[PDB]
Structure 1
Amino acid sequence: GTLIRVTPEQPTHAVCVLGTLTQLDICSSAPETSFSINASPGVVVDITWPLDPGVEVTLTMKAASGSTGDQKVQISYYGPKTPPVKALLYLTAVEISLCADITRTGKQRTWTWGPCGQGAILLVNCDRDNLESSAMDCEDDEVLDSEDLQDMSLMTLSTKTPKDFFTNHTLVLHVARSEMDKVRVFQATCSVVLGPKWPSHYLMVPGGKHNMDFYVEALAFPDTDFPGLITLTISLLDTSNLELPEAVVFQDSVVFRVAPWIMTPNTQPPQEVYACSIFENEDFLKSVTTLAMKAKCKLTICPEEENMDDQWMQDEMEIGYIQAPHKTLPVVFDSPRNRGLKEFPIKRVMGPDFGYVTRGPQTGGISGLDSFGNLEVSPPVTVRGKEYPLGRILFGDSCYPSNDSRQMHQALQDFLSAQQVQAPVKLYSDWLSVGHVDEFLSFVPAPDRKGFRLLLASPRSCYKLFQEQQNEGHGEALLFEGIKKKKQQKIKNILSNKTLREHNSFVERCIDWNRELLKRELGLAESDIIDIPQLFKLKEFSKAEAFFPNMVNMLVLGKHLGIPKPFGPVINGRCCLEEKVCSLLEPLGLQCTFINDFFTYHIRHGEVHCGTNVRRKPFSFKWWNMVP
């Protein structure tokens, strides 16, 4: 909006940017009734008229000016006995449009969510396209590679003005000091114009028709102190007066939203599997390699030289992605646990079209619940009307905070919440010794229902299984048959052990709490849930450990499952625990491969899921079309 004050004493000169509201104040400086307006064909004047303040006179140009003051407006002040007196207004029309991908196709003043919403997307340039280097591309203020531009968002300044227009006018591009530390802008028309150091920059633009392309990168993900919006503004400045300060004639903006980090649940097709080569574990890696081949996945193994004897590939990282209309890339969330695998995410997971992010204190102040076996996501779900088309992040906690209770670090929690798009749900995992949600739950694909099943570890199911076997006459059947370096236990002695039953009743109560929590927060019914037979035992600090290899802690590669080999009671030639799991999962079209991880992973308090990790296909559903 602009109000031009015309005067019969002196002629007025003004600039009009196309698509803006221009109005005239005719009365204030009028002499002493009545007035009439006559304008050149290029000016459309909407409103033989009385001199009354309330009469709105609005002007709109249709095209940009060829020369300065080429459009005219003439206001004639007259009266009953007064010859007309003329006030002149010389107009110069110009086009000044700051353009971006606001429709989100790859080509209001606010950013709005949803399929009918508007607002451009910005990716955090957190990968490393630069060949042979250490830092992320966004850590410096240069565009080192042409491929790097593919990660950036295009913004174009289009101008149509007279040839001499920028003799007396100047354009300045700017971003608030609040947001300058989170964005960098390069001029292509690459050299930096806006960034952490510079909040504003004078643009060198020639008169006539011109197009100036910019490439923009984000430097920070959404977080506690960053909602995730970045506004870039162009200002047209009148610099006609050599002694007076510059005056702003017109401002226009584009609002960018920084793309969130997004996780992928087990129901998303796998693309790449990760694992470690360690102590005598060659046969474990054979089984995983075969499983990866069956699921047609790329396979990456971290060797002992880089491992520092850290076998827990699940725990150091989580592989997610970031997504814009023009570019989608995987992004590794590096856990602050910083064990032997500390460098793996940095050295050769991060790279060309593979982003990096980390959170929390790096030198200490961490717990086991910061290991990313404690970080998972559900498949897409709808909870009492509200859609979660990218699912819901799940992470483990205590039921309330005490001196002995553990939590995932608040910096990690806050980051996950600030991504917004997978609204995190706190589960109860602190009753476990290790304390990870993957120790009692998993998700698998399914051909019916909601496209999945929630698997939960279940003492109830195992007691039921073992009692059925004893009822059928297999009381002597031995748990841990096949393991020569351990004392076997008969089904009858397992069932008669009152303390083991007490322990498992408490664990059942802990899992049941999570069951109902998941049913409420994911909108699940019992028909979505399958119980996996699993016994537990309480050890140090009354914390739960797996009695036999924790079968729910499995590697899910599409319909191919890598399940820990339980070494259960062999009845009719086969482990009754394997047969039970097969009977539950084979009807869903899942293929169960039981992997021997006993002396390699199990005895060190983890299983197949703990020893591996997976990169999965990003969702086809675009995050910005959600309404969180």
Structure 2
Amino acid sequence: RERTVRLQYGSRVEAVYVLGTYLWTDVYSAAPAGAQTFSLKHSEHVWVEVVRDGEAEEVATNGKQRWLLSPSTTLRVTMSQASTEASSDKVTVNYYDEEGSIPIDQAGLFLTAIEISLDVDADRDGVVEKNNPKKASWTWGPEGQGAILLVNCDVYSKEALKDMSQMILRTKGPDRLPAGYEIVLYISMSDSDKVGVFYVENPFFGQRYIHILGRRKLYHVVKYTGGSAELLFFVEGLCFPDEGFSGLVSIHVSLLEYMAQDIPLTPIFTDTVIFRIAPWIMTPNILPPVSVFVCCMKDNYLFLKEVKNLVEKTNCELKVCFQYLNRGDRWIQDEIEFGYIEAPHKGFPVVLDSPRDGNLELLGPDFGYVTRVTSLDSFGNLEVSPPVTVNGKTYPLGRILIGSSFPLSGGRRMTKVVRDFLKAQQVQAPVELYSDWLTVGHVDEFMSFVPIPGTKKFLLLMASTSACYKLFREKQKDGHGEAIMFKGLGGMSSKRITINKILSNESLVQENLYFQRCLDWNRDILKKELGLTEQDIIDLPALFKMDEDHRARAFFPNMVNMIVLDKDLGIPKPFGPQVEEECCLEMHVRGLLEPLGLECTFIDDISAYHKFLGEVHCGTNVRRKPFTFKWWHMVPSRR
């Protein structure tokens, strides 16, 4: 960067020189009228070139050389090291008329050189490198650079600031700035609700970290100390990317020059760093489980016992939660979603919370928490795929899936605020599915993903009414038509539901043909947007009843919504027709999954209620390890 500094005659100009710039210096304006030539001297640590027309020549500290005075003959002045108390850094120009060789006047330039750099970890290794040349930009991908900020998901103490990003103002210079200069850190009004910055204003008096930039504070004057100094700041993000906020914020430092009273200070030098606030990222079922969270009523004993036995087969821990006045019976699934954020220096799991009635809980200090209508707003209506490649385009973090209705239908849709939030995170590139054919309207009622043990591959599991009818028709042909469903549920007994009773119900057949069309519409979108073929899909038998809105609810428990812990699957117990004293639905599902090395455990969540009307009274959610792939290595499509 070249900067303009002009001489003024009979006199001296004093200026601060910031390393990394250079000065171009007009010597002609300060020449007395009628002067013809000029000569110059300079000190050891100032480099001076005479530039005539654009041709530059280095000039010695004390030569006698003279040049013609011309507007097109100027000086270029460079310094490679900061001034100290031992410095006298200067350039002096003498002017001559035609008459003789003794100077008729002289104009000086007295310089104080300082280093000023606002530094961040732009190369994304967790250390704050010195003046990264790319620190003022932010680029995606393996070769990308620029600093990363975490949203704070929770006078201050240093220990509390350990999660934040470091920003260091590094300076070098003499004991003090020359008269009339100050250094100021600042942000835009727009960015003021996106960030906050802390530091210790008075280190002589203690370690107290104070908030110096943020809401209502757009600038902070910083104290200059001489020699080589560093000021350590901590920076936090205040919010995630959203519809109107890209995720990018900037922080500036300027050296300002005092002009006079009632005149703004002049920005002599400005340095800028950019941060991107890390997005919230969802974890698919293929990622290693850490903890399993369940909620149910205290007396659903079978559910608790069987979930405990499932989890005991794994290395996961179980966390048991009961029911709360402000929350639905499924809240750990519906009102809570486990996700994470990551920066080069650190990362943590982050839970999104959307309580049914609003807040009045939480599990653990280890998580960050973000707290916020139709049933489509539930997190049961949100899923995320394993990493996929689609027509050459890779989604290394997978893609988020959200249930919706058809564009022209006038049906339900998840609220714009949530849809826009998910879209703005960018790295999971969400896809809308069709859930509005279901009374409750959640994608988790019809689909899930499971890893294939011993491989890096996965399966999509789809509810299928067609598979259920085929199975029941086979068992009827085999002489089992009188086999009864719901054995052991006393509140169902008087209905005497048998395979025969189901197969002879004409309207129910028609309803379920229609529901299969809805499932297949989803199947096609999933194959398209996830790059899946028929070999990647398994169909689990399912059956629904229709309401007055022509929407589906489960006839028997939906097996697709299962607890996935690697090879081990907690599968809702279906209570299907018994053949040879085994549920034909359980046997069929085992025959599909077990050959792939998946281990099935059926979990009874409904017996405690004595009947099943389509509603499930328990919920589960699994906290998983984050992806090994760093989100900042992705190259998302430009919006």
TM-score by length of 2: 0.86
- Which segment is superposed worse, 382-391 or 481-490? 481-490
Q: Distance in 2 between matches of 1:313 and 1:210?
A: 50
Q: Does structure 1 residue 612 correspond to structure 2 residue 620?
A: yes
Q: Does structure 1 residue 179 correspond to structure 2 residue 191?
A: yes
SS of the aligned residue for 1:395 comes to: strand
Shift, 1:622, TM fit: 1.6
Q: In structure 2, do the counterparts of structure 1 residues 70 and 471 end up closer, same or farther at CA, with 3 Å as the change threshold?
A: farther
CA deviation digits over 1:372-402, x for unaligned, max 9?
A: 1011111111222222111111111111255
SS of the aligned residue for 1:566 comes to: coil
Shift, 1:593, TM fit: 0.5
Q: Distance in 2 between matches of 1:326 and 1:125?
A: 14
Q: Which residue of 1 aligns with 2:276?
A: 257
Can you give the 5+ residue segments of structure 1 that lack an aligned partner in the other structure? Answer: 128-141, 360-365
CA contact 1:316–1:338 (8 Å) conserved in 2: no
Q: Which residue of 1 aligns with 2:79?
A: 61
Partner amino acid, structure 2, of 1:5: R
Q: In structure 2, do the counterparts of structure 1 residues 574 and 76 end up closer, same or farther at CA, with 3 Å as the change threshold?
A: farther
Q: Select 1:397's aligned residue among 391, 404, 413.
A: 404
Shift, 1:309, TM fit: 7.2
Q: Distance in 1 between matches of 2:89 and 2:537?
A: 73
Shift, 1:245, TM fit: 4.6
Q: Distance in 1 between matches of 2:559 and 2:74?
A: 77
CA deviation digits over 1:506-563, x for unaligned, max 9?
A: 1111111111111222222222221111122212311101121110011112221110
1:452-601 maps to which residues of 2 (within 5 A)?
Answer: 452-484=458-490, 485-486=492-493, 487-600=495-608
Q: In structure 2, do the counterparts of structure 1 residues 304 and 374 end up closer, same or farther at CA, with 3 Å as the change threshold?
A: closer
Q: Which residue of 1 aligns with 2:53?
A: none
Q: Which residue of 1 aligns with 2:43?
A: 40
Q: Does structure 1 residue 326 correspond to structure 2 residue 339?
A: no
Q: In structure 2, do the counterparts of structure 1 residues 94 and 500 end up closer, same or farther at CA, with 3 Å as the change threshold?
A: same
Q: Distance in 1 between matches of 2:339 and 2:628?
A: 14
Shift, 1:80, TM fit: 8.5
CA deviation digits over 1:454-496, x for unaligned, max 9?
A: 1111112222323333444444443334445333444344334
Q: Does structure 1 residue 231 correspond to structure 2 residue 232?
A: no
Q: In structure 2, do the counterparts of structure 1 residues 593 and 234 end up closer, same or farther at CA, with 3 Å as the change threshold?
A: same
CA contact 2:177–2:224 (8 Å) conserved in 1: no
Q: Distance in 2 between matches of 1:561 and 1:21?
A: 68
CA contact 2:606–2:612 (8 Å) conserved in 1: yes
Q: Does structure 1 residue 97 correspond to structure 2 residue 98?
A: no
Q: Which residue of 2 aligns with 1:71?
A: 89
SS of the aligned residue for 2:162 comes to: helix
CA contact 2:557–2:614 (8 Å) conserved in 1: no
Q: In structure 2, do the counterparts of structure 1 residues 448 and 25 end up closer, same or farther at CA, with 3 Å as the change threshold?
A: farther
Partner amino acid, structure 1, of 2:278: A
Q: Distance in 2 between matches of 1:381 and 1:95?
A: 48
Q: Select 2:367's aligned residue among 354, 360, 379.
A: 354
Q: Distance in 1 between matches of 2:102 and 2:240?
A: 64
Q: Does structure 1 residue 383 correspond to structure 2 residue 390?
A: yes
Q: Distance in 2 between matches of 1:548 and 1:533?
A: 10
CA contact 2:170–2:229 (8 Å) conserved in 1: yes
CA contact 1:166–1:205 (8 Å) conserved in 2: no
CA contact 1:169–1:240 (8 Å) conserved in 2: no
Q: Select 1:441's aligned residue among 441, 447, 454.
A: 447
Shift, 1:619, TM fit: 1.6
Can you give the 5+ residue segments of structure 2 that lack an aligned partner in the other structure? Answer: 50-55, 58-66, 128-133, 204-208
Q: Does structure 1 residue 147 correspond to structure 2 residue 159?
A: yes
Q: Does structure 1 residue 124 correspond to structure 2 residue 130?
A: no
SS of the aligned residue for 1:624 comes to: helix
CA deviation digits over 1:160-196, x for unaligned, max 9?
A: 1111326532111111111112222111361221121
Q: Which residue of 2 aligns with 1:132?
A: none
SS of the aligned residue for 2:528 comes to: helix
Q: Does structure 1 residue 431 correspond to structure 2 residue 437?
A: yes
SS of the aligned residue for 2:167 comes to: strand
Q: Which residue of 2 aligns with 1:408?
A: 414
Task: Give 1 or 2 for the bigger CA radius of gyration.
Answer: 2
Q: Which residue of 2 aligns with 1:624?
A: 632
Q: Which residue of 1 aligns with 2:237?
A: 218
Q: In structure 2, do the counterparts of structure 1 residues 518 and 38 end up closer, same or farther at CA, with 3 Å as the change threshold?
A: farther
Q: Select 1:163's aligned residue among 168, 175, 191.
A: 175
Partner amino acid, structure 1, of 2:83: S
Partner amino acid, structure 1, of 2:43: S
Partner amino acid, structure 2, of 1:353: D
SS of the aligned residue for 1:416 comes to: helix
Partner amino acid, structure 2, of 1:126: C
1:334-345 maps to which residues of 2 (within 5 A)?
Answer: 334-335=353-354, 337-338=356-357, 342-344=359-361
Partner amino acid, structure 1, of 2:508: L
Shift, 1:572, TM fit: 4.2
Q: In structure 2, do the counterparts of structure 1 residues 467 and 166 end up closer, same or farther at CA, with 3 Å as the change threshold?
A: farther
Q: Distance in 2 between matches of 1:5 and 1:166?
A: 18
CA contact 2:326–2:356 (8 Å) conserved in 1: no
Q: Distance in 2 between matches of 1:526 and 1:73?
A: 79
CA contact 1:67–1:92 (8 Å) conserved in 2: no
Shift, 1:440, TM fit: 0.4
CA deviation digits over 1:412-458, x for unaligned, max 9?
A: 11111111121221111011001000000101111477521111111
- Which segment is superposed worse, 147-156 or 69-78? 69-78
Q: Which residue of 2 aligns with 1:18?
A: 19
- Which segment is superposed worse, 380-389 or 33-42? 33-42
Q: Distance in 1 between matches of 2:457 and 2:71?
A: 67
Q: Distance in 2 between matches of 1:314 and 1:440?
A: 15
Q: Which residue of 2 aligns with 1:372?
A: 379
SS of the aligned residue for 1:184 comes to: strand
Percent identity at matched positions?
52
Q: Distance in 1 between matches of 2:271 and 2:125?
A: 22
Q: Distance in 2 between matches of 1:469 and 1:43?
A: 96
- Which segment is superposed worse, 154-163 or 447-456? 447-456
Shift, 1:74, TM fit: 4.3
Q: In structure 2, do the counterparts of structure 1 residues 91 and 375 end up closer, same or farther at CA, with 3 Å as the change threshold?
A: same
SS of the aligned residue for 2:182 comes to: strand
CA deviation digits over 1:87-107, x for unaligned, max 9?
A: 432221101111111111110
Q: Does structure 1 residue 201 correspond to structure 2 residue 220?
A: yes
Q: Distance in 1 between matches of 2:616 and 2:262?
A: 76
CA contact 1:122–1:152 (8 Å) conserved in 2: yes
- Which segment is superposed worse, 496-505 or 524-533? 496-505
Shift, 1:571, TM fit: 3.1
CA contact 2:30–2:107 (8 Å) conserved in 1: no
